[PDB]
Amino acid sequence: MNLKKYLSTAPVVATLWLFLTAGILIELNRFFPDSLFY
Amino acid sequence: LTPCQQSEAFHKREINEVRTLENRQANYEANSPSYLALQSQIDQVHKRFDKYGTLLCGQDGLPHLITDGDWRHAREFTIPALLFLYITGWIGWVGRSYLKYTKETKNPTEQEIILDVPMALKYMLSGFLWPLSAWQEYRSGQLLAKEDEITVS
Amino acid sequence: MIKKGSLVKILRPESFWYNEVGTVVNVETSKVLYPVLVRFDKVNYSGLNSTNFSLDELVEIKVEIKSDT
Amino acid sequence: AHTVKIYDNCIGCTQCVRACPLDVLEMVPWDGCKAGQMASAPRTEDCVGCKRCETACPTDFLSIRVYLGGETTRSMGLAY
Amino acid sequence: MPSPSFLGSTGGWLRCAETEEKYAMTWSSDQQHIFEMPTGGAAVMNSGDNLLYLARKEQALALATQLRTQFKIQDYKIYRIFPSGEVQYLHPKDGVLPYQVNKGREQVGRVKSTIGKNVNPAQV
Ligand SMILES: CC1=C(/C=C/C(C)=C/C=C/C(C)=C\C=C\C=C(C)\C=C\C=C(C)\C=C\C2=C(C)CCCC2(C)C)C(C)(C)CCC1
Numbered sequence: 001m002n003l004k005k006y007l008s009t010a011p012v013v014a015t016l017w018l019f020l021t022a023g024i025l026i027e028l029n030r031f032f033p034d035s036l037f038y
Numbered sequence: 039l040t041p042c043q044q045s046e047a048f049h050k051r052e053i054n055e056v057r058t059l060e061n062r063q064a065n066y067e068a069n070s071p072s073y074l075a076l077q078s079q080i081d082q083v084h085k086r087f088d089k090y091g092t093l094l095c096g097q098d099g100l101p102h103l104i105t106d107g108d109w110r111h112a113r114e115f116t117i118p119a120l121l122f123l124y125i126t127g128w129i130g131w132v133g134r135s136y137l138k139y140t141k142e143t144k145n146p147t148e149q150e151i152i153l154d155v156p157m158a159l160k161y162m163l164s165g166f167l168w169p170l171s172a173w174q175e176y177r178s179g180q181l182l183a184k185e186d187e188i189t190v191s
Numbered sequence: 192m193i194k195k196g197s198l199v200k201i202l203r204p205e206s207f208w209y210n211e212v213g214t215v216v217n218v219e220t221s222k223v224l225y226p227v228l229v230r231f232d233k234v235n236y237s238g239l240n241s242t243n244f245s246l247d248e249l250v251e252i253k254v255e256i257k258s259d260t
Numbered sequence: 261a262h263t264v265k266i267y268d269n270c271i272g273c274t275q276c277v278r279a280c281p282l283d284v285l286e287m288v289p290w291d292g293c294k295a296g297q298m299a300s301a302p303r304t305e306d307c308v309g310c311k312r313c314e315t316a317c318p319t320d321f322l323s324i325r326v327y328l329g330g331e332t333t334r335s336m337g338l339a340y
Numbered sequence: 341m342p343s344p345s346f347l348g349s350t351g352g353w354l355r356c357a358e359t360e361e362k363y364a365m366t367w368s369s370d371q372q373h374i375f376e377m378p379t380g381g382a383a384v385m386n387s388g389d390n391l392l393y394l395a396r397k398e399q400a401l402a403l404a405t406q407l408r409t410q411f412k413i414q415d416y417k418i419y420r421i422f423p424s425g426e427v428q429y430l431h432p433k434d435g436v437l438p439y440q441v442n443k444g445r446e447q448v449g450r451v452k453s454t455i456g457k458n459v460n461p462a463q464v
């Protein structure tokens with residue numbers, strides 16, 4: 001119960017979302033290169 | 039300034055960079071598994087040069103580009119690497135703004151900035167089509183503000 | 192003369208809080224120059240909540256009575 | 261030395277002489293306030309101007325002003 | 341008058357203290373106690389009034405503020421002038437300054453707006 005309130009704090013939510021944003025980019029530069037088509 | 043597939047002064051940099059990497063490459067035995075990955079790394083190096091050659095690039099080997107809006111180079115500025123920043127950043131910004139609209143009500147304002155129910159963060163996905171709807175709501179923001187600002191006296 | 196608890200707009204000759212919406216804490220008939228204390232949500236740098244204000248200040252904010260459905 | 265000027269925002273909660281180090285201000289009976297006190301500074305010759313009353317001053321814009329003026333031995337707080 | 345004894349020098353035998361005005365405080369001290377000077381270590385407080393020398397005015401008022409918090413005692417501070425003029429500047433009303441008094445007056449008081457207007461219509 002209260003563990004979700006601690007999970008809903010600003011630092012925990014911030015680190016969780018920043019982990020998502022950073023991991024997506026680590027996987028992006030590891031998988032396909034940007035195709036980019038004129 | 040000529041493109042690098044015709045610029046003889048760019049391919050020489052590819053040869054020179056691989057030459058500097060080759061001395062580090064040959065000191066170790068290629069048959070070892072911990073250094074078999076260097077050939078895959080130089081494969082990444084090789085697979086990187088061919089795409090940039092298509093973009094106009096400096097004769098010196100320093101590959102330049104275009105931001106004037108020229109349709110032949112919209113890929114380096116205008117369309118992809120630019121518009122997505124605007125959308126993605128503002129998809130976050132207007133989502134934050136919608137959260138700012140729901141930042142009042144009875145439950146304490148400090149509680150609704152920091153200790154927010156996770157459901158609002160899950161609703162963030164609402165903004166698929168920000169543009170004009172966000173323009174309406176920002177009009178209403180300036181409107182309902184009714185020029186209520188600080189003194190500056 | 193207006194009843195206590197009205198939504199206020201600050202028009203003090205010195206504090207240009209251009210219509211910062213707030214409510215009247217209480218109304219005093221003691222008749223001084225800066226009597227009215229109001230709940231000022233914009234916590235100033237001093238840190239307090241309610242300060243004294245003039246008789247000018249607020250006139251009205253609802254502006255409507257019967258046409259306000 | 262320093263020039264002490266009292267605004268008309270006074271509530272008379274005695275915050276001056278409570279905060280004030282060497283008692284520059286002074287509470288005086290007044291007929292235009294809620295509590296009935298007003299701050300007055302007769303010993304302005306001894307004022308140092310440390311500006312600790314503006315902290316305890318309640319009003320939105322402070323009620324006790326002390327504009328920076330000249331500096332003498334009484335206003336420098338030096339022991340020599 | 342019997343005064344607390346203090347060691348460490350520093351405060352005494354200063355030429356500036358001799359040529360400049362000095363402050364003299366006192367306190368009832370109904371019981372033997374031990375206190376601290378605002379500029380010194382620790383010293384024992386004797387019975388009866390105790391007269392000391394102070395070189396600053398803030399030093400003369402902080403000690404009174406510190407004494408009032410201990411026990412409930414009326415404080416007296418007298419401020420002397422350079423030659424030999426001895427005037428009662430602390431409690432000239434003999435009523436505590438934060439508390440209300442009957443002897444009321446106004447010194448250097450401008451009753452104007454709050455943004456500014458520094459001109460004074462009347463000094464007295
Ligand atoms: C283009 C690109 C991209 C994208 C990216 C992004 C999207 C990013 C972002 C991000 C975000 C979204 C955010 C960020 C941020 C940061 C910050 C936010 C910070 C900071 C700081 C500062 C600088 C400060 C300031 C200030 C304030 C706060 C106020 C007062 C004043 C001062 C100054 C102090 C990708 C990779 C995809 C691809 C390629 C490239």
Ligand code: SF4
Pocket residue numbers: 269270271272273274275276298299313316317318319322323324
């Ligand atoms: S600081 Fe101002 S409001 Fe407070 S007691 Fe002194 S004069 Fe009155």
Ligand code: SF4
Pocket residue numbers: 276279280281282283284285307308309310311312313314326
């Ligand atoms: S100017 Fe300084 S010493 Fe004088 S009353 Fe204000 S805070 Fe006290």
